[PDB]
Amino acid sequence: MNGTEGPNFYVPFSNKTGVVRSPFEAPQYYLAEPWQFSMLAAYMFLLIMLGFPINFLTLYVTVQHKKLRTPLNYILLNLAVADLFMVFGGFTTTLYTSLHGYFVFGPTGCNLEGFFATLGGEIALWSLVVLAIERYVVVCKPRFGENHAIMGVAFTWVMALACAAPPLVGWSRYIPEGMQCSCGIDYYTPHEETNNESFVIYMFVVHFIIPLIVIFFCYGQLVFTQKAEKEVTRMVIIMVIAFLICWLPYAGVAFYIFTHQGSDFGPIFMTIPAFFAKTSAVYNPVIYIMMNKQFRNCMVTTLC
Amino acid sequence: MNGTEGPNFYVPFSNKTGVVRSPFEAPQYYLAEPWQFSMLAAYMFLLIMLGFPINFLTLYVTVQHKKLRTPLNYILLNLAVADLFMVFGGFTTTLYTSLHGYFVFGPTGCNLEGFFATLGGEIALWSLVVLAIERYVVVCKPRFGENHAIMGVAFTWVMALACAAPPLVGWSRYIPEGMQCSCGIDYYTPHEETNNESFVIYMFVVHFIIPLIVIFFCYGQLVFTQKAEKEVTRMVIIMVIAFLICWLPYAGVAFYIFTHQGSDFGPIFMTIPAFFAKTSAVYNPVIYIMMNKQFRNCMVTTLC
C-alpha cells in the first residue's frame, strides 16, 4: 500500500518516515504547506458569503410572487432550500476545518461535512430527473401540473436521503479525502464491518447511472420528435450540462480509486475535484437569473 | 522597549526568548497561530472578489450613460478608479503575503501594499472636501460646474500623492504593522535618516485635520443658515459618516503609538483596525447604489 490506513481514515501519504498523523488529531502539515490549506479556507469563505445571499434571495422572491408556481419554479425553490442546508449545515465545518488544517470536531464534523454535500448533490440530480420527465411530457405529449411538481419535490428528498443517510448508520461511512479537509464516501478501504463494497456499487448504479439513463432517454425523445416552453427547455439543457461539468471529474476519480485501492496517488489527486464540486451550492440560481426572464424581472422588482 | 526593532521593521513582540524573525525572511508563526493568518487571507480574497466587479461596474455604467455628468457622478467615477488601483496594485500583495505568513516579496511588497492603500484613502478624503465645497456652494449660494468638478478630481490626486509618495523616496517609510501582513506609515521608531517625526506631524495636520476643518465648516453652513439636490446632500452626509467609521479607529491607534513609542502592545492591537480600514475599497459604490436613484436605474438598465 502507498498510503496509510487507520481505524477511520485513509491518508494518501506513506508512513515510511513516521510523520503521518490522524486527521482527527493534528494538523496535516506533513502532506501540504500551510498556504495550501489557507487557499481552501479562503475559497470556502467565498462560497459561504455568496451562497447564503443568492439562495436566500431565490427563496424569498419565489414565496413573495404567487405567479411563480410552474414546475420549474418549484424545483428551483427546492434547490435553493437544499443549497442553504449545504452552506450552513456543511460548509461551516469545511471552513473551520480548513483554517486549522484538520477535523478539529473529529468524526462528527466529518459526518456533517459529508452528509449535507451528499444530500444536496443528490437532490440536484434527482431534480434533473423530475425536470426531464416534465419536459418530455410537456413537449412530446405522450398534463404535468402543480401536484406532479410537488410530488417530484418530495421524491427528490426520499431518494437523496436513501443515499446520504446509510453512511451515518453503518452502511459505508464518511471519510476524509485529499488534503483531509473534506469528507466523502469511503472508496479507499474494504472495511467489511460496514460492507463498503456493496454501498459503492449501489450508489453508482441507483444514484448515478439510472438517473442519467432516464434524463438522456427523455432528451433523446425530445430531439427525434411555444416560445415560453422553449425558454424552459433551454434552461434545463444548461442545468444538465452544468451538472456534468461539476460532478463528472469527481465521479471519475472516485471510481478510479475504488478500482485501484492502495495505488500510488497523492493528496492533490482528490483535493481539486472535491472542492470544485462544492460550487454546486451556488451555480443553479445563477443560471436561473440568466435564463428565465419572468423570474429575473421578479427579482429586480423585489430588489428595487 | 517591549518590541523588537530591526533595520526596516518593528515587531510588537519581545525578543527576550530569541524567537523573533524578520517579517521579510520567515513566517510570523511565533506571534500568531496559522489559523489567524488564514483568517486574514480569506478576508482579503473576499474583498478582491467583491471589489473588482462592483468598482468595474460603476466605471462601466458611468462611461456608458452620457447623462451621468454631475459633480457627484465624476467624483464617484474617480473613486471607482482609485478603488481598482487599490485592489490590483495593493490587495494582491496582501493576499499573497497573508497566505504565506510574511512579506515573501520583501520591502518592495511592503511598498506596494502601503502606497496604494494610502493613495486610495487620501483620494477618498480629499474627494469629500470637494463634495463639501460643492454642496456648500450649491445649497448656500454664497455656479459649480463640470470644469470645477474635474478640476477637483485632479486636485485629489495631487494632494494624495503629496502624502503617499515621499515614504517611497526617503521622507518616512512604509513598515509592516500588527501581525506583519500589512504595511503603513512608520509611527514606531525615530529613524532620523528618514526624518520620521516631521512626516507624521505633516500627515496628521495637512492630510487629516485640515480636510476635516473644511468639511465641517461647510456642513456648519448647511445646518445653521430641490428634491433632486436634497438626495445628493443626503448621500454626501452618509459618505462622510462612513469614512469616519472606517478611518477613525486606525487614526486613533496610530496616534497613540506615535506618542507612546516602545510601550507594551501586541500584534492584535493594530491588526484589526488595519484590516477593518481595507473595506474602504468597496463601500463607496454600495452607498451609491442605495442612495442615488438615477445611478441605480442606469445600473439596472445596463446590467439587464
Ligand SMILES: *[C@@H]1O[C@H](CO)[C@@H](O[C@@H]2O[C@H](CO)[C@@H](O)[C@H](O)[C@H]2NC(C)=O)[C@H](O)[C@H]1NC(C)=O
Ligand atoms: C506512523 O509511524 C509512526 C512511527 O512508527 C507512528 O508513531 C508511533 O505510534 C505508536 C502507536 O501509538 C507509538 O507507540 C509510538 O510512540 C509512535 N512513535 C512516534 C515516533 O511517534 C504513527 O502512529 C504512524 N501513524 C499512523 C497514522 O499510523
Ligand SMILES: *[C@@H]1O[C@H](CO)[C@@H](O[C@@H]2O[C@H](CO)[C@@H](O)[C@H](O)[C@H]2NC(C)=O)[C@H](O)[C@H]1NC(C)=O
Ligand atoms: C532575536 O534574538 C536572537 C537570539 O539572540 C537573534 O538570533 C541570533 O542572531 C545573531 C546575529 O545574526 C546570530 O549570530 C545568532 O546565531 C542568532 N541566534 C539564533 C539562535 O538564531 C535574532 O537575530 C533576534 N531577532 C531579531 C529580529 O533581532
Ligand SMILES: CCCCCCCC/C=C/CCCCCCCC(=O)OC[C@H](O)CO
Ligand atoms: C499619476 C497621477 C495623475 C494625476 C492627474 C489626474 C488627472 C485626471 C484628470 C482628467 C481630465 C480628463 C478630461 C475629460 C474630459 C471630459 C469631458 C466631458 O465629459 O464633459 C465635457 C464638458 O463639455 C465640459 O464642460
Ligand SMILES: CCCCCCCC/C=C/CCCCCCCC(=O)OC[C@H](O)CO
Ligand atoms: C462618527 C463615528 C465614529 C465611529 C468610530 C468610533 C471609534 C472609537 C474608537 C477609537 C479608537 C481609539 C484608539 C485608542 C487607543 C488606546 C489604546 C490604549 O490605551 O491601550 C493601551 C494598551 O496597552 C494597548 O495594548
Ligand SMILES: *C/C=C(C)/C=C/C=C(C)/C=C/C1=C(C)CCCC1(C)C
Ligand atoms: C466536499 C464534499 C464532497 C466531495 C461531497 C461528496 C458527495 C458525493 C459522494 C456525491 C456523489 C454523487 C453525486 C451527488 C452526483 C454524481 C454521482 C455521485 C454518486 C458521484
Ligand SMILES: *C/C=C(C)/C=C/C=C(C)/C=C/C1=C(C)CCCC1(C)C
Ligand atoms: C492595510 C493598509 C493600511 C492600514 C493603509 C494605511 C493608510 C494610511 C496610513 C492612511 C492614512 C489616513 C487616511 C488616508 C485618511 C484618514 C487620515 C489618515 C492620515 C489616518
Ligand SMILES: *[C@@H]1O[C@H](CO)[C@@H](O)[C@H](O)[C@H]1NC(C)=O
Ligand atoms: C503502490 O505503488 C506502486 C508504484 O506504482 C505500485 O507498483 C503498487 O502496486 C502500489 N500498491 C498497490 C497496493 O496498488
Ligand SMILES: *[C@@H]1O[C@H](CO)[C@@H](O)[C@H](O)[C@H]1NC(C)=O
Ligand atoms: C514596556 O512596558 C512596560 C510595562 O507597561 C512599561 O512600563 C515600559 O515603559 C514600556 N517600555 C517603554 C519604552 O515605554
